[PDB]
Design a protein around this ligand. Structure first.
Ligand SMILES: [Zn+2]
Ligand SMILES: [Zn+2]
Ligand SMILES: [Zn+2]
Ligand SMILES: [Zn+2]
Lengths: 79, 77
DNA sequence: CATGACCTACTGACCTAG
DNA sequence: CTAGGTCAGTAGGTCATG
């Protein structure tokens, strides 16, 4: 309840279902808002930690969904 | 006689006429009090249920009025 | 130009006067 | 009964930095 279940950074609370950090939060939010398809240049299992979370987006996105981060809870843009 | 007619959630009775949950009741109370006008980013046809009632505020406010929810049943501050 | 560290609004479950 | 009310927790920001 104190760590980001995706990259191991300090959590700021539950976001879209799972305890995560501000970096992983905005990442998911930025993807579904714009509907972004990601390709992994590796074997679809790149490690995701605090230091190399931005190495492979694809696996960082998949790691969010395997941890239960809901696409549905991402509201639409405002104003 | 216990289902919210707007989003299918559990209903606590009549709120401004129509059977609705506390979430949709509070949303309608705040939409007239502040006179908030909404715009939709899609084709004004978003699905309104328990899981994405917070997705589009435009379609959620539209489904309220279409379900019979009355604007005059809201008292002033 | 995709990041993320800062910042507010908006929920809705849980209260009480008529 | 259905009108009111709050406020912690999760949503929405924006914008300088690489
Ligand atoms: Zn993270
Ligand atoms: Zn990868
Ligand atoms: Zn409802
Ligand atoms: Zn919409």
């Amino acid at each position: 309840k104190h760590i980001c279940a995706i990259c191991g950074d300090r959590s700021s609370g539950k976001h879209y279902g799972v305890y995560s950090c501000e970096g992983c939060k905005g990442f998911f939010k930025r993807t579904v808002r714009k509907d972004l398809t990601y390709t992994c240049r590796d074997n679809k299992d790149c490690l995701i930690d605090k230091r190399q979370r931005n190495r492979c987006q694809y696996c960082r996105y998949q790691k969010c969904l395997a941890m239960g981060m809901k696409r549905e809870a991402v509201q639409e843009e405002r104003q």
